[PDB]
Amino acid sequence: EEHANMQLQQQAVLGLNWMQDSGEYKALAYQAYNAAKVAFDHAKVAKGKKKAVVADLDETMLDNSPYAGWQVQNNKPFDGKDWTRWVDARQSRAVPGAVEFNNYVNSHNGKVFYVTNRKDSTEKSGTIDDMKRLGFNGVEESAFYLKKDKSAKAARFAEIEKQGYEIVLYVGDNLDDFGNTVYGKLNADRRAFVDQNQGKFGKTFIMLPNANYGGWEGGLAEGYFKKDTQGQIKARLDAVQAWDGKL
Amino acid sequence: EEHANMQLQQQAVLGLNWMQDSGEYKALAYQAYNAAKVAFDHAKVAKGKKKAVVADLDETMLDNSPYAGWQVQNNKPFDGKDWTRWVDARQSRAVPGAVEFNNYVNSHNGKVFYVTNRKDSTEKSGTIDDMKRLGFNGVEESAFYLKKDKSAKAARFAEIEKQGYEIVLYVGDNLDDFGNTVYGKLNADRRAFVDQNQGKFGKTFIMLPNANYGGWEGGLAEGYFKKDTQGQIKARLDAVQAWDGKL
C-alpha cells in the first residue's frame, strides 16, 4: 500500500530535518570528535602493540542523509538494492569533525580501521572514491573491513587485533559498533548494555547521533524487520510512551 | 484541519522512538555528562570568583518525552497551555547522567544554576517538586532562573555573573542555551555559530540530543512559528535535502 509507505516514511521527517539542518547536530558531531581526540591522545597500549582506532562509516564518518531524503520524497522503505545505487552515486558527505580526527589519528602513531556494513563486493568502489574526495587520509583498501557474510562486527574487530593492533577506542552511531553483546536484541537489553558501560561513553566508546535508522529501530519489537509496513508503523506507535493528559 | 495536525505530529514519531527507547540516546546523554565532569574538574576561575555551571532543564536535565508522546497520540501541535498542564502533572523524568553530574558539581566547590524557559509564575512549583523527587540536590528556589519576560537566556547568564560567579561551562540541547548570538536566527546562521565554536563542544559547551523540538525547528524557515499547520508541514518538507535517485 502506497498509503502505508508514505506514513512510515513521513515519521522520519522531523528527525531528518534535525540531522540535516540543525546546528545542534553539528555540535554533537564536534563534541564526539573532540572527545575522541582526547581519548586517543591519552591512550596507552600494551608493549609491542600498534595503536588502532575502529570507526564505523555510515552516520559516523559518512553522512548518507540525502538517501533518507529520497526515501521521504518517494515513500520508499529501506531496500538494500536502492542503497547500493546510492553508494554507487558517489554523493556521500562527511560527518563534521570526522576527517580531521581520522587524519590526526593516522598522522600521530595510530591507524583508523573502517569496520562498516557497506558491502565489500558491491559497495567498496563508491565508498573509497567518496572518502578520497572528502579528504580522508589512509583509505587504501586494507584499511577497510567491509561486510562480507555477517553484519555483526566483533569478528572484524578480532581480525584487527590479530594483525598486532590494540584498539584504543571505537566510534559509532549504533551500539553494535562497540561489539556483539546486544546485536539483534530488543531495546531493553540495549539500554541495559549502555547502563552497564556508562563510564565508557565519550572515552573508549564514542557516540554519534542517528535518529533515522539503526539497531534501535529493529529493537522496537520482536521480529520488527520481518514485519510488513503496517506492522512496522504499529510497532513504532506502540512503542510511544505518552502522558495521559491528567494530573 | 485534523488531517494536517496528524501529519505534522506523525513526522515526530521516529525521532521520538529514538529518544524514548534507544540505548544510543542514553549513551549520548552519558557521553555528554562524562565530558561535562571532566570539563568541570579542569576548570579554573578568576581570583575571587565562585565556580558556576549553567544548565538548561528541558531535554537537558529533565526528560519531557511523555508530553511529545501525548502530542503524537492526540494530534496536538505544541501549545503553551498544554505545556503548563504537563509541568503541573509532575511526571517529568531525569535525563541519564544529569542528577549525578548536578550533585557532583554541587558537592565539589561548584553551583549549578538552572536557566530554563519553564515559566517562573506558573511552572515553578511542578519543576521544583519533580527535581526534588528525581534526586537533584541544590534545588532551592534561588538556584533557578525561570522565564519571566524573555526566552533569550543571555541576560540571566549575566545575572549569575553579577552575583560573583564565573560560569565554567554550559549544558544544553539548544544552541540558545549557550548565548543569544543566534537566537531567533535561521539554521544557516546557527550552523555557522557552531563552526565558529567547533573546539568548545564537549568542553565548555556541553550538548544533549533533541530531535523533537527547539530553535532548530523555527530555524527551518523565516517566520516558521507564526505559520499555520500546513505551512509548517511545507517548511519541513521543503527543508529536506534529497538524492535525486541518479548516479
Ligand SMILES: Nc1ncnc2c1ncn2[C@@H]1O[C@H](COP(O)(O)=S)[C@@H](O)[C@H]1O
Ligand atoms: N534506513 C535504513 N534502515 C536499515 N538499514 C539501513 C538504512 N540506511 C542504510 N542502511 C544499511 O545499514 C548499513 C549501516 O552500516 P553500519 O556499518 O553504519 S551498521 C548501511 O551500509 C546500509 O546497508
Ligand SMILES: Nc1ncnc2c1ncn2[C@@H]1O[C@H](COP(O)(O)=S)[C@@H](O)[C@H]1O
Ligand atoms: N514541542 C515544542 N515546541 C516548541 N516549544 C516547546 C516544545 N516542548 C516544550 N516547549 C517549550 O520550550 C521550553 C523549552 O525550554 P528550554 O529552557 O529547554 S529553551 C519549554 O519549557 C516549553 O515552554
Ligand SMILES: [Mg+2]
Ligand atoms: Mg553506522
Ligand SMILES: [Mg+2]
Ligand atoms: Mg532545553
